[PDB]
Amino acid sequence: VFSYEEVIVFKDLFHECIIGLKFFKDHVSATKDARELMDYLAFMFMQMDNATFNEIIEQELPFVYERMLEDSGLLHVAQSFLTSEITSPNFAGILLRFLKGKLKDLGNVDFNTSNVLIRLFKLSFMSVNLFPNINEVVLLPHLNDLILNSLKYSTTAEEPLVYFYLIRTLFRSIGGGRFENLYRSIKPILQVLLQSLNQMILTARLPHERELYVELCITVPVRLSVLAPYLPFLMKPLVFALQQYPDLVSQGLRTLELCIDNLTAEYFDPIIEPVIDDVSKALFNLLQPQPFNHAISHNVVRILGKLGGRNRQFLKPPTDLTEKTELDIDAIADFKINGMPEDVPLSVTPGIQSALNILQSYKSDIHYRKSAYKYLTCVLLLMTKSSAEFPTNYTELLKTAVNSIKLERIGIEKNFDLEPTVNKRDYSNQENLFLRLLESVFYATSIKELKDDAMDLLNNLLDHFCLLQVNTTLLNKRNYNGTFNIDLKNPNFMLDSSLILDAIPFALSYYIPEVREVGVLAYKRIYEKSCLIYGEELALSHSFIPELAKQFIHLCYDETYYNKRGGVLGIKVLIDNVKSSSVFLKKYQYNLANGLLFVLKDT
Amino acid sequence: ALEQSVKSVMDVPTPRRQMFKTFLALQNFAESRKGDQEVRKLCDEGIQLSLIKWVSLPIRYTPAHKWLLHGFQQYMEFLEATQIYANLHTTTVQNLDSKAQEIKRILQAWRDRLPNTWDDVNMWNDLVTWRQHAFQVINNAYLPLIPALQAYRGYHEIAWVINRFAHVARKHNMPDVCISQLARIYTLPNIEIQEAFLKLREQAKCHYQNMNELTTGLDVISNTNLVYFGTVQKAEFFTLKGMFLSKLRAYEEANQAFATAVQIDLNLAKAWAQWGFFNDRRLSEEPNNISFASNAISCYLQAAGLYKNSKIRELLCRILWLISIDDASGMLTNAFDSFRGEIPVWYWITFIPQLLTSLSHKEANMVRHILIRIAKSYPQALHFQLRTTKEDFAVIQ
């Protein structure tokens, strides 16, 4: 026991010893003399009574925490309180009740504060598995609240991966204990929130976002050998764990063994049935010889040997034969070879899929990335070249074609001659190819020292498509001037310049915000150009601005939150542009309201 | 004489000759205890050889990959046989029922780990022969410990991997080896509760085709009256007598054989199904309006109540076709409506159109009980068909 004027002296001693570690900074990364004094300060307070040390550390822990945000070596204080003490559960309780309050702003702070908070959480979890028989009962209250509040606070967080990182650290800190039975009342909500975050990143962040979610969805702690009846929640991340991440593989294989060893082979076989072809096809990729790791190959051999005929009774003839998409087709031009009398036709697209994979990956060297970008723009400008020629009187023809929209009953000269058909497969492949190249021009603005020429080329392409839209406007009067005309003349079959109606809603729905900014800049630019070449009174009824607006409403009805964000971005820039006229926003009010209401219902 | 034959050919090695070398090392560990544990090295070099052979093949699954999968199972059974023999070498102090549980667990894992029935008979034969080697080792090592016990722990469950082989060759239309494999079962002269079961069942199913052989199935069952540890084997014996007697032209004696096959248990649905087939074969020489068909539909309805989770839909087809006769006497409706048992409501789903066009046909209100039991348990199967045929009949009134 102590009096009041003795515990005041002990509080001031702890305060001055924590302040005095500022003399020994640089001027778990601390200097040797500061580490020695932190060992002295930790050992000094170990033999004090626990009932006074608890109130000293509880009154001092916010000040110790705000001193940790300047000299980060003071974590070696708290570690030395909970790695070896007779009063380790008490400090673990004080620290967990402090971090429970600090958890709400764990996402919305900078890198230093989030780093310090994650290290305090990691220390508090390692204190549990360092002393199992001594109190881990300090952790089992506010354990489900930790999981639930991390999942809830990651919704409105600015950096929402720190919460998942925390759930991963908590799962990797435990396993082999008793308190995984109060945790079994959280498994369905955790696994639905993990699978519906696992596959809803169809435009994944490109970091460890997919790896983190599939690492969380498997490797949950279950007291029973087979975790739960909630095993079909694990079948879709098991395919990703075996298939796409070679550092998750040795985890997921272990999970398979835990299902293959004791599941009775009757209950388990309908569960793996929707995934057995993907599971076996990713398992067959891991059967590689000795330069590849034999610790994860002999696992696959053991699994496939423990399954007698069950490793091959569910495979049929292959239903996945690749049918030569737009990343596989040839666009053929003539090249002059010096050893030949005439030019020779060869394909300009043998490295499109490779150049897209080079451009997408951050790791590749800038020279390779810049040459890949130059290759894609070469193929794209070759596809755009044979419409880039303009007549000598294009200004008066454009003016005539834009004031000829406001006339009624345009007489159509009739002629009786057939046009050739479309060949839908080659048209679809060329359309998707132009779309992929335009989308990579939009993606190129997310890279420094590729952004300036990408923005210049994008401005040229956008005000080219704005000038090509007037042909589609003039040809949509073939749908009028005669309610059934069959004897008219149409230009045969081309890329109809309505594939900027699939690229600008792509750029708004993309998972880099720096290209969503380029998407809204693209919409502002085509708004300016469409108001320029038409006039404001009819650019809202005939130009891109009505048409693309309908696309924005269609983005509100999609089945993932990326396209809904793109739709509300397009709707917000639309209703910030058009407010001077009261015909467009009042004509389109019901559909816009239903779209913005469907974003609220379905999300 | 086998080691020299292996060593002369175990250059430019294949996975098969490597498997033979690993089995020779395993037998060296088996017959001479405190062996080598180079079996743990030969299995690993065989796994690496098989992985090189797997990468040498195409990426997508070819039929050649099936033998590599069988080789993986053979190496894992080699390692489990190493564990079996290591447990078998420490039970020399007569520590039975303490280490026999591990042997029983690995043998029970082996009984459920057998290839698919459409796989090659060389695959089946290879697994059967090397499991017979692994069983011969434990039968040799339990042989000194027999008289010192004073049934017993000498297994001789080799008969299992004979019988399961002798079944599957009969699936592969190889009846000569299916008869010839039921001759290596006489290594122990006792009648077991399951060896005699599959032995007599497969020997009676041998003489079912090639109709100059049915008398050889008749004379082998008709003289065996001592029960081979069971009261269900005599019922299937009696209905197999019914099959063999009804295969030749016999009117009443085959009916008597089916009656004495069916009175004993009332729990074998194969007897009910074969009695229904026999009544249909008697029906096929006359018009289908004779009230003898009520016996056929009663044996069919009994043959679908407890024959569940199987191929019963042809019995339901026979019911739907034999019901549709135009008899004036109400004997068939009695035979349907006095059935005491639970009708397989889920298997009546696949004939929902043939039920729903049976309401328009007359002499059919016993279809209504089936459709009512469908609608109260499986409501989404009937709904679209009901609305379609309802709006069909509603516009023709």
Binding site: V226, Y267, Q290, H298, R302 | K41, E80, Q83, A109
Partner: peptide, 26 residues
């Protein structure tokens, strides 16, 4: 019903060292 008993645990090796075979003129 849902669970079966424990399978025999086959211990895979940790430090196996096999030789990559030289190609042959087969």
């Amino acid at each position: 019903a849902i669970f079966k008993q424990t399978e025999p645990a086959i211990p895979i090796s940790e430090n196996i060292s096999t030789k990559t075979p030289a190609p042959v003129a087969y």
